[PDB]
Protein backbone atom coordinates (compact mmCIF):
# COMPACT_ATOMS: atom_id res chain seq x y z
CA UNK A 1 0.00 0.00 0.00
CA UNK A 2 0.94 3.67 0.30
CA UNK A 3 1.89 5.80 3.31
CA UNK A 4 -0.71 7.92 5.10
CA UNK A 5 1.09 11.22 4.52
CA UNK A 6 1.53 10.61 0.79
CA UNK A 7 -1.61 8.70 -0.11
CA UNK A 8 -2.06 7.39 -3.56
CA UNK A 9 -4.58 8.63 -6.09
CA UNK A 10 -5.92 6.39 -8.86
CA UNK A 11 -8.42 7.96 -11.25
CA UNK A 12 -10.79 5.22 -12.25
CA UNK A 13 -12.36 6.14 -15.58
CA UNK A 14 -14.79 4.90 -18.25
CA UNK A 15 -15.52 1.28 -17.31
CA UNK A 16 -18.23 -0.98 -15.91
CA UNK A 17 -18.02 -0.73 -12.13
CA UNK A 18 -19.67 -3.42 -10.00
CA UNK A 19 -19.83 -2.15 -6.44
CA UNK A 20 -21.74 -5.29 -5.47
CA UNK A 21 -18.62 -7.48 -5.41
CA UNK A 22 -17.33 -4.88 -3.00
CA UNK A 23 -20.44 -4.39 -0.91
CA UNK A 24 -21.09 -8.05 -0.21
CA UNK A 25 -17.53 -9.29 0.12
CA UNK A 26 -17.88 -9.42 3.92
CA UNK A 27 -14.10 -9.09 4.17
CA UNK A 28 -14.32 -5.37 4.91
CA UNK A 29 -14.45 -4.24 8.49
CA UNK A 30 -15.83 -0.82 7.57
CA UNK A 31 -17.97 0.13 4.57
CA UNK A 32 -19.64 3.51 5.02
CA UNK A 33 -21.32 5.40 2.21
CA UNK A 34 -22.12 9.07 2.62
CA UNK A 35 -23.47 10.80 -0.43
CA UNK A 36 -25.34 7.68 -1.46
CA UNK A 37 -26.42 4.49 0.27
CA UNK A 38 -24.47 1.44 -0.94
CA UNK A 39 -27.10 -0.68 -2.69
CA UNK A 40 -27.93 2.06 -5.21
CA UNK A 41 -24.38 2.36 -6.51
CA UNK A 42 -24.88 -0.27 -9.22
CA UNK A 43 -27.67 1.86 -10.68
CA UNK A 44 -26.05 5.28 -11.08
CA UNK A 45 -23.52 6.91 -13.40
CA UNK A 46 -20.94 9.64 -12.78
CA UNK A 47 -18.08 11.38 -14.58
CA UNK A 48 -15.07 10.22 -12.57
CA UNK A 49 -14.35 7.96 -9.64
CA UNK A 50 -11.21 8.54 -7.68
CA UNK A 51 -9.71 5.95 -5.37
CA UNK A 52 -7.29 6.96 -2.64
CA UNK A 53 -5.27 4.36 -0.76
CA UNK A 54 -3.23 4.34 2.43
CA UNK A 55 -2.51 2.60 5.74
CA UNK A 56 -3.31 3.84 9.25
CA UNK A 57 -3.77 2.57 12.77
CA UNK A 58 -6.83 0.64 13.77
CA UNK A 59 -8.51 3.33 15.81
CA UNK A 60 -7.85 6.17 13.40
CA UNK A 61 -10.40 4.89 10.92
CA UNK A 62 -12.94 7.13 12.58
CA UNK A 63 -11.16 10.25 11.37
CA UNK A 64 -11.70 9.30 7.72
CA UNK A 65 -15.12 10.89 7.56
CA UNK A 66 -16.50 14.34 6.69
CA UNK A 67 -16.02 16.75 9.55
CA UNK A 68 -13.49 15.23 11.96
CA UNK A 69 -10.33 16.34 13.73
CA UNK A 70 -7.14 14.66 14.83
CA UNK A 71 -3.57 14.12 13.68
CA UNK A 72 -4.77 12.28 10.60
CA UNK A 73 -7.64 14.42 9.39
CA UNK A 74 -5.95 17.66 10.37
CA UNK A 75 -2.78 17.26 8.36
CA UNK A 76 -2.53 13.98 6.57
CA UNK A 77 -5.74 13.47 4.61
CA UNK A 78 -8.80 15.72 4.78
CA UNK A 79 -12.26 14.86 3.36
CA UNK A 80 -14.51 17.73 2.25
CA UNK A 81 -17.63 18.51 4.19
CA UNK A 82 -20.05 17.45 1.44
CA UNK A 83 -18.34 14.18 0.57
CA UNK A 84 -20.10 11.90 -1.88
CA UNK A 85 -18.27 8.59 -2.08
CA UNK A 86 -17.71 5.69 0.27
CA UNK A 87 -14.98 4.71 2.71
CA UNK A 88 -13.79 1.10 2.94
CA UNK A 89 -11.35 -0.32 5.46
CA UNK A 90 -10.07 -3.71 6.50
CA UNK A 91 -7.53 -5.08 8.93
CA UNK A 92 -4.18 -6.11 7.54
CA UNK A 93 -2.14 -7.21 10.53
CA UNK A 94 -0.50 -10.17 8.82
CA UNK A 95 0.72 -8.26 5.77
CA UNK A 96 2.05 -4.99 7.15
CA UNK A 97 3.26 -5.77 10.66
CA UNK A 98 6.56 -7.54 11.11
CA UNK A 99 8.45 -8.76 14.16
CA UNK A 100 10.86 -6.15 15.41
CA UNK A 101 8.65 -3.37 14.13
CA UNK A 102 7.80 -2.22 10.63
CA UNK A 103 9.20 1.31 10.58
CA UNK A 104 8.35 2.03 6.95
CA UNK A 105 4.88 3.47 7.56
CA UNK A 106 5.16 7.13 8.53
CA UNK A 107 2.72 9.91 9.20
CA UNK A 108 2.99 13.66 9.57
CA UNK A 109 2.46 15.00 13.06
CA UNK A 110 3.29 18.72 12.74
CA UNK A 111 2.04 21.25 10.23
CA UNK A 112 1.50 24.98 10.08
CA UNK A 113 -2.16 24.76 9.11
CA UNK A 114 -4.77 22.09 8.55
CA UNK A 115 -5.11 20.76 5.04
CA UNK A 116 -7.63 21.85 2.50
CA UNK A 117 -9.83 18.92 1.48
CA UNK A 118 -8.00 16.51 -0.83
CA UNK A 119 -4.78 18.48 -0.48
CA UNK A 120 -1.45 16.68 -0.23
CA UNK A 121 1.87 17.64 1.36
CA UNK A 122 5.02 15.55 0.98
CA UNK A 123 7.55 18.17 2.06
CA UNK A 124 10.07 17.41 4.78
CA UNK A 125 11.07 20.78 6.20
CA UNK A 126 12.09 21.03 9.82
CA UNK A 127 9.08 22.25 11.74
CA UNK A 128 9.50 25.28 13.99
CA UNK A 129 7.38 25.27 17.12
CA UNK A 130 8.85 28.16 19.09
CA UNK A 131 9.75 31.60 17.81
CA UNK A 132 13.43 30.82 17.41
CA UNK A 133 14.40 30.12 13.79
CA UNK A 134 15.58 26.60 13.05
CA UNK A 135 18.14 26.85 10.21
CA UNK A 136 17.55 23.28 9.12
CA UNK A 137 18.93 21.64 12.26
CA UNK A 138 17.05 19.82 14.99
CA UNK A 139 16.80 20.90 18.59
CA UNK A 140 14.33 22.23 21.13
CA UNK A 141 11.29 23.61 19.30
CA UNK A 142 12.81 22.46 16.00
CA UNK A 143 11.36 19.05 15.17
CA UNK A 144 11.46 16.67 12.28
CA UNK A 145 7.84 16.50 11.10
CA UNK A 146 7.42 12.77 10.36
CA UNK A 147 6.99 9.91 12.80
CA UNK A 148 6.69 6.19 12.09
CA UNK A 149 4.23 3.62 13.33
CA UNK A 150 6.32 0.83 14.63
CA UNK A 151 3.90 -1.96 13.86
CA UNK A 152 4.42 -5.26 15.58
CA UNK A 153 2.39 -8.46 15.31
CA UNK A 154 1.72 -8.67 19.04
CA UNK A 155 -0.21 -5.40 19.19
CA UNK A 156 -3.68 -5.12 20.60
CA UNK A 157 -6.40 -4.35 18.10
CA UNK A 158 -6.60 -0.65 17.53
CA UNK A 159 -2.86 -0.61 17.13
CA UNK A 160 -2.65 -3.02 14.23
CA UNK A 161 -2.46 -1.67 10.70
CA UNK A 162 -5.64 -1.12 8.74
CA UNK A 163 -5.69 -0.53 5.01
CA UNK A 164 -8.10 2.12 3.77
CA UNK A 165 -9.53 2.95 0.35
CA UNK A 166 -11.65 6.06 -0.14
CA UNK A 167 -13.80 6.10 -3.27
CA UNK A 168 -14.92 9.55 -4.29
CA UNK A 169 -17.48 9.87 -7.07
CA UNK A 170 -17.37 13.23 -8.75
CA UNK A 171 -19.62 14.80 -11.38
CA UNK A 172 -18.03 17.69 -13.27
CA UNK A 173 -20.02 18.66 -16.36
CA UNK A 174 -19.07 16.17 -19.07
CA UNK A 175 -21.45 14.09 -21.22
CA UNK A 176 -21.19 10.85 -19.23
CA UNK A 177 -18.83 8.21 -17.84
CA UNK A 178 -18.57 4.98 -15.83
CA UNK A 179 -21.80 3.32 -14.68
CA UNK A 180 -22.98 0.01 -13.25
CA UNK A 181 -23.69 -3.10 -15.34
CA UNK A 182 -27.13 -4.03 -16.69
CA UNK A 183 -28.32 -7.64 -16.52
CA UNK A 184 -30.20 -9.39 -19.34
CA UNK A 185 -32.01 -12.55 -20.40
CA UNK A 186 -32.82 -14.68 -23.44
CA UNK A 187 -34.72 -13.36 -26.43
CA UNK A 188 -38.01 -15.10 -27.15
CA UNK A 189 -39.97 -14.97 -30.39
CA UNK A 190 -43.54 -15.21 -31.67
CA UNK A 191 -45.12 -14.03 -28.40
CA UNK A 192 -46.40 -10.62 -27.39
CA UNK A 193 -43.57 -9.59 -25.10
CA UNK A 194 -42.25 -6.57 -23.23
CA UNK A 195 -38.76 -5.91 -24.53
CA UNK A 196 -35.77 -3.64 -23.97
CA UNK A 197 -32.94 -3.57 -26.54
CA UNK A 198 -30.10 -1.53 -24.97
CA UNK A 199 -32.40 1.44 -24.47
CA UNK A 200 -35.25 0.75 -26.90
CA UNK A 201 -38.25 0.00 -24.70
CA UNK A 202 -41.30 -1.51 -26.34
CA UNK A 203 -43.99 -4.19 -26.63
CA UNK A 204 -44.87 -6.64 -29.36
CA UNK A 205 -44.16 -9.87 -31.16
CA UNK A 206 -40.58 -10.41 -32.33
CA UNK A 207 -39.94 -12.26 -35.57
CA UNK A 208 -36.95 -13.32 -37.68
CA UNK A 209 -36.29 -10.74 -40.37
CA UNK A 210 -34.99 -10.79 -43.91
CA UNK A 211 -33.91 -7.14 -44.24
CA UNK A 212 -30.27 -6.07 -44.19
CA UNK A 213 -29.19 -3.03 -42.19
CA UNK A 214 -25.92 -1.30 -42.79
CA UNK A 215 -23.32 -2.51 -40.32
CA UNK A 216 -23.67 0.47 -38.05
CA UNK A 217 -27.47 0.80 -37.86
CA UNK A 218 -29.27 -0.47 -34.76
CA UNK A 219 -33.00 -0.23 -35.44
CA UNK A 220 -35.28 0.57 -38.35
CA UNK A 221 -38.20 2.95 -38.54
CA UNK A 222 -41.32 3.19 -40.68
CA UNK A 223 -42.89 6.12 -42.47
CA UNK A 224 -44.80 7.97 -39.72
CA UNK A 225 -41.78 7.15 -37.57
CA UNK A 226 -42.43 4.01 -35.51
CA UNK A 227 -39.76 1.46 -34.61
CA UNK A 228 -40.39 -1.69 -36.61
CA UNK A 229 -37.07 -3.55 -36.66
CA UNK A 230 -34.18 -3.99 -34.25
CA UNK A 231 -30.79 -5.67 -34.22
CA UNK A 232 -29.92 -7.97 -31.34
CA UNK A 233 -26.71 -6.65 -29.77
CA UNK A 234 -25.25 -10.03 -28.86
CA UNK A 235 -25.93 -12.10 -31.99
CA UNK A 236 -26.36 -9.13 -34.41
CA UNK A 237 -29.46 -10.33 -36.26
CA UNK A 238 -32.37 -8.23 -37.47
CA UNK A 239 -35.80 -8.89 -35.95
CA UNK A 240 -39.12 -7.33 -36.92
CA UNK A 241 -41.43 -5.90 -34.29
CA UNK A 242 -45.09 -6.34 -34.95
CA UNK A 243 -47.76 -5.17 -32.48
CA UNK A 244 -49.76 -7.77 -30.61
CA UNK A 245 -53.39 -8.09 -31.45
CA UNK A 246 -56.09 -5.59 -30.57
CA UNK A 247 -59.54 -5.06 -31.98
Amino acid at each position, epitope marked *: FASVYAWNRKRISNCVADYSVLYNSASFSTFKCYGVSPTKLNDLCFTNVYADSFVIRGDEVRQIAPGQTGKIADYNYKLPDDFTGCVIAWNSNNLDSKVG*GN*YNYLYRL*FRKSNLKPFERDISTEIYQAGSTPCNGVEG*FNC*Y*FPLQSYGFQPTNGVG*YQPYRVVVLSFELLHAPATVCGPKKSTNLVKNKCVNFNFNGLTGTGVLTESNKKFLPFQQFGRDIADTTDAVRDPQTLEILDITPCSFG
Partner: antibody
Amino acid sequence: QVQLQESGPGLVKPSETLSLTCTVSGDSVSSGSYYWSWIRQPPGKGLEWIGYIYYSGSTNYNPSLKSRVTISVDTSKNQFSLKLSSVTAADTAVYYCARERCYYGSGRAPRCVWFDPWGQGTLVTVSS
Amino acid sequence: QSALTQPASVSGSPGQSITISCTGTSSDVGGYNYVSWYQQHPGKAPKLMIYDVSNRPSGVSNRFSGSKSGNTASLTISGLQAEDEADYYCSSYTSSSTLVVFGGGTKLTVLG
Protein backbone atom coordinates in the same frame (compact mmCIF):
# COMPACT_ATOMS: atom_id res chain seq x y z
CA GLN B 1 7.70 26.44 32.14
CA VAL B 2 7.05 22.81 33.04
CA GLN B 3 7.20 20.91 36.31
CA LEU B 4 7.14 17.27 37.36
CA GLN B 5 6.25 15.51 40.60
CA GLU B 6 6.23 11.88 41.71
CA SER B 7 3.86 10.11 44.09
CA GLY B 8 2.97 6.69 45.44
CA PRO B 9 5.66 5.80 47.97
CA GLY B 10 5.64 3.47 50.98
CA LEU B 11 8.02 1.02 52.63
CA VAL B 12 7.33 -1.66 50.02
CA LYS B 13 8.11 -5.22 51.13
CA PRO B 14 9.89 -7.94 49.14
CA SER B 15 8.30 -9.65 46.11
CA GLU B 16 5.59 -6.98 45.80
CA THR B 17 4.66 -4.74 42.86
CA LEU B 18 5.31 -1.07 43.61
CA SER B 19 3.81 1.82 41.65
CA LEU B 20 5.15 5.34 41.28
CA THR B 21 3.18 8.03 39.48
CA CYS B 22 4.64 11.12 37.83
CA THR B 23 2.33 14.04 37.07
CA VAL B 24 3.07 16.87 34.67
CA SER B 25 2.11 20.54 34.73
CA GLY B 26 2.70 23.13 32.04
CA ASP B 27 2.67 20.80 29.03
CA SER B 28 0.11 18.29 27.84
CA VAL B 29 1.12 14.65 27.64
CA SER B 30 -0.52 13.77 24.33
CA SER B 31 1.09 16.47 22.25
CA GLY B 32 3.82 14.50 20.59
CA SER B 33 7.20 16.17 20.61
CA TYR B 34 8.47 14.73 23.92
CA TYR B 35 8.87 11.25 25.37
CA TRP B 36 8.18 10.70 29.05
CA SER B 37 10.68 8.46 30.80
CA TRP B 38 11.89 7.02 34.10
CA ILE B 39 15.38 6.92 35.63
CA ARG B 40 16.47 5.27 38.84
CA GLN B 41 19.64 5.73 40.85
CA PRO B 42 20.78 3.52 43.72
CA PRO B 43 22.40 5.55 46.50
CA GLY B 44 26.08 6.28 46.16
CA LYS B 45 26.01 4.93 42.61
CA GLY B 46 25.52 6.10 39.06
CA LEU B 47 22.35 6.51 37.05
CA GLU B 48 20.69 3.95 34.83
CA TRP B 49 17.80 4.11 32.41
CA ILE B 50 14.50 2.23 32.57
CA GLY B 51 11.92 3.05 29.92
CA TYR B 52 9.79 5.52 28.03
CA ILE B 53 6.25 5.90 26.72
CA TYR B 54 5.14 8.02 23.78
CA TYR B 55 1.64 9.47 23.59
CA SER B 56 0.49 6.77 21.18
CA GLY B 57 1.30 3.92 23.51
CA SER B 58 4.63 2.85 22.09
CA THR B 59 6.87 1.55 24.87
CA ASN B 60 10.51 0.65 25.32
CA TYR B 61 12.35 -0.83 28.27
CA ASN B 62 15.80 -1.68 29.46
CA PRO B 63 16.66 -5.27 28.47
CA SER B 64 18.21 -5.99 31.85
CA LEU B 65 14.94 -4.89 33.45
CA LYS B 66 12.85 -6.36 30.66
CA SER B 67 9.75 -8.52 31.29
CA ARG B 68 9.33 -6.93 34.70
CA VAL B 69 8.20 -3.31 34.23
CA THR B 70 5.16 -1.80 32.51
CA ILE B 71 4.64 1.95 32.18
CA SER B 72 1.31 3.51 31.18
CA VAL B 73 -0.32 6.87 30.42
CA ASP B 74 -3.36 8.70 31.74
CA THR B 75 -4.35 11.63 29.52
CA SER B 76 -7.22 12.55 31.79
CA LYS B 77 -5.12 13.82 34.68
CA ASN B 78 -1.95 14.39 32.58
CA GLN B 79 0.15 11.77 34.34
CA PHE B 80 2.10 8.60 33.60
CA SER B 81 3.09 5.80 35.95
CA LEU B 82 5.27 2.71 36.12
CA LYS B 83 4.71 -0.57 37.93
CA LEU B 84 7.67 -2.81 38.69
CA SER B 85 6.74 -6.30 39.86
CA SER B 86 8.58 -8.97 41.90
CA VAL B 87 10.77 -6.47 43.69
CA THR B 88 14.10 -7.63 45.08
CA ALA B 89 16.30 -5.88 47.65
CA ALA B 90 18.45 -4.25 44.96
CA ASP B 91 15.83 -1.70 43.87
CA THR B 92 16.19 0.56 46.91
CA ALA B 93 16.89 3.64 44.84
CA VAL B 94 15.85 7.19 44.12
CA TYR B 95 13.44 7.32 41.20
CA TYR B 96 13.23 10.37 38.95
CA CYS B 97 10.77 11.07 36.19
CA ALA B 98 11.79 13.19 33.24
CA ARG B 99 10.89 13.81 29.61
CA GLU B 100 13.17 13.13 26.62
CA ARG B 101 13.70 14.91 23.34
CA CYS B 102 14.02 11.78 21.17
CA TYR B 103 15.10 12.78 17.63
CA TYR B 104 13.53 11.10 14.63
CA GLY B 105 15.00 7.81 13.46
CA SER B 106 14.95 6.36 9.96
CA GLY B 107 12.77 3.30 9.58
CA ARG B 108 14.19 1.75 12.73
CA ALA B 109 12.85 3.10 16.02
CA PRO B 110 13.43 6.69 17.16
CA ARG B 111 16.65 7.81 18.86
CA CYS B 112 16.44 10.05 21.92
CA VAL B 113 18.92 12.25 23.78
CA TRP B 114 19.69 14.92 26.41
CA PHE B 115 16.32 14.68 28.20
CA ASP B 116 14.95 17.85 29.78
CA PRO B 117 13.35 18.57 33.16
CA TRP B 118 14.04 15.93 35.81
CA GLY B 119 11.31 15.08 38.29
CA GLN B 120 11.80 15.73 42.00
CA GLY B 121 12.96 12.25 42.95
CA THR B 122 11.29 10.32 45.75
CA LEU B 123 13.53 7.88 47.61
CA VAL B 124 11.88 4.46 47.60
CA THR B 125 13.34 1.79 49.86
CA VAL B 126 12.66 -1.94 50.12
CA SER B 127 13.19 -3.80 53.40
CA SER B 128 11.43 -5.71 56.18
CA GLN C 1 28.23 -1.44 27.74
CA SER C 2 28.96 1.71 29.74
CA ALA C 3 30.90 4.83 28.74
CA LEU C 4 33.34 4.84 31.66
CA THR C 5 33.56 8.46 32.81
CA GLN C 6 37.34 8.22 32.47
CA PRO C 7 38.31 9.21 36.01
CA ALA C 8 36.15 8.90 39.13
CA SER C 9 37.37 11.80 41.26
CA VAL C 10 38.81 15.15 40.15
CA SER C 11 40.71 17.97 41.84
CA GLY C 12 40.71 21.62 40.80
CA SER C 13 42.00 25.04 41.82
CA PRO C 14 39.52 27.93 41.90
CA GLY C 15 39.88 30.10 38.85
CA GLN C 16 41.72 28.56 35.96
CA SER C 17 40.38 25.59 33.96
CA ILE C 18 39.20 21.98 34.35
CA THR C 19 38.57 19.55 31.50
CA ILE C 20 36.63 16.31 32.02
CA SER C 21 36.90 13.54 29.44
CA CYS C 22 34.38 10.80 28.74
CA THR C 23 35.48 7.77 26.75
CA GLY C 24 33.41 4.78 25.77
CA THR C 25 33.09 2.11 23.12
CA SER C 26 33.08 2.52 19.33
CA SER C 27 31.16 4.76 16.92
CA ASP C 28 27.89 3.62 18.51
CA VAL C 29 28.80 6.07 21.32
CA GLY C 30 31.71 8.16 20.04
CA GLY C 31 31.06 8.40 16.31
CA TYR C 32 27.59 9.86 16.67
CA ASN C 33 26.57 13.41 17.33
CA TYR C 34 24.43 12.87 20.42
CA VAL C 35 26.14 13.28 23.81
CA SER C 36 25.03 15.21 26.88
CA TRP C 37 26.31 16.20 30.29
CA TYR C 38 24.54 16.56 33.62
CA GLN C 39 25.29 18.31 36.90
CA GLN C 40 23.77 16.87 40.05
CA HIS C 41 24.14 18.70 43.30
CA PRO C 42 24.26 16.42 46.37
CA GLY C 43 20.62 15.97 47.24
CA LYS C 44 19.01 17.28 44.07
CA ALA C 45 17.88 16.25 40.64
CA PRO C 46 20.52 16.50 37.90
CA LYS C 47 20.48 19.28 35.34
CA LEU C 48 21.78 19.41 31.78
CA MET C 49 23.98 22.17 30.43
CA ILE C 50 25.42 20.55 27.30
CA TYR C 51 23.52 18.73 24.56
CA ASP C 52 23.87 17.28 21.08
CA VAL C 53 27.61 17.44 21.74
CA SER C 54 28.17 21.13 22.42
CA ASN C 55 25.15 23.41 22.84
CA ARG C 56 24.22 25.55 25.81
CA PRO C 57 20.48 25.69 26.56
CA SER C 58 18.51 28.80 27.46
CA GLY C 59 20.56 30.29 30.26
CA VAL C 60 23.70 28.70 31.73
CA SER C 61 27.16 30.02 32.54
CA ASN C 62 29.51 30.50 29.63
CA ARG C 63 32.29 28.51 31.30
CA PHE C 64 30.61 25.29 30.19
CA SER C 65 31.77 23.90 26.85
CA GLY C 66 32.55 20.50 25.39
CA SER C 67 33.88 18.73 22.34
CA LYS C 68 34.27 15.36 20.66
CA SER C 69 37.30 13.33 19.61
CA GLY C 70 37.01 9.81 18.21
CA ASN C 71 35.65 7.56 20.94
CA THR C 72 36.12 10.10 23.73
CA ALA C 73 33.96 13.08 24.58
CA SER C 74 35.29 16.09 26.44
CA LEU C 75 33.77 18.64 28.79
CA THR C 76 35.81 21.63 29.91
CA ILE C 77 35.41 24.63 32.20
CA SER C 78 37.16 27.97 31.82
CA GLY C 79 37.11 29.37 35.33
CA LEU C 80 36.25 27.72 38.58
CA GLN C 81 33.96 28.85 41.37
CA ALA C 82 33.04 27.51 44.78
CA GLU C 83 29.52 26.59 43.69
CA ASP C 84 30.62 24.13 40.99
CA GLU C 85 31.32 21.14 43.24
CA ALA C 86 28.95 18.43 42.04
CA ASP C 87 28.91 15.16 40.17
CA TYR C 88 29.03 14.95 36.40
CA TYR C 89 27.63 12.29 34.12
CA CYS C 90 27.67 11.57 30.40
CA SER C 91 24.86 10.41 28.21
CA SER C 92 24.90 8.81 24.76
CA TYR C 93 22.66 7.16 22.17
CA THR C 94 23.88 3.71 21.16
CA SER C 95 22.41 1.17 18.76
CA SER C 96 22.85 -1.99 20.80
CA SER C 97 19.79 -2.40 23.02
CA THR C 98 20.29 -0.35 26.18
CA LEU C 99 19.20 2.53 23.95
CA VAL C 100 20.76 5.22 26.12
CA VAL C 101 23.84 4.72 28.28
CA PHE C 102 24.96 6.71 31.31
CA GLY C 103 28.28 7.74 32.82
CA GLY C 104 29.77 6.51 36.07
CA GLY C 105 30.25 9.94 37.59
CA THR C 106 33.12 12.32 38.32
CA LYS C 107 33.52 14.29 41.53
CA LEU C 108 34.67 17.88 41.04
CA THR C 109 36.38 19.42 44.06
CA VAL C 110 37.36 23.04 44.69
CA LEU C 111 40.71 22.63 46.44
CA GLY C 112 41.57 25.90 48.18
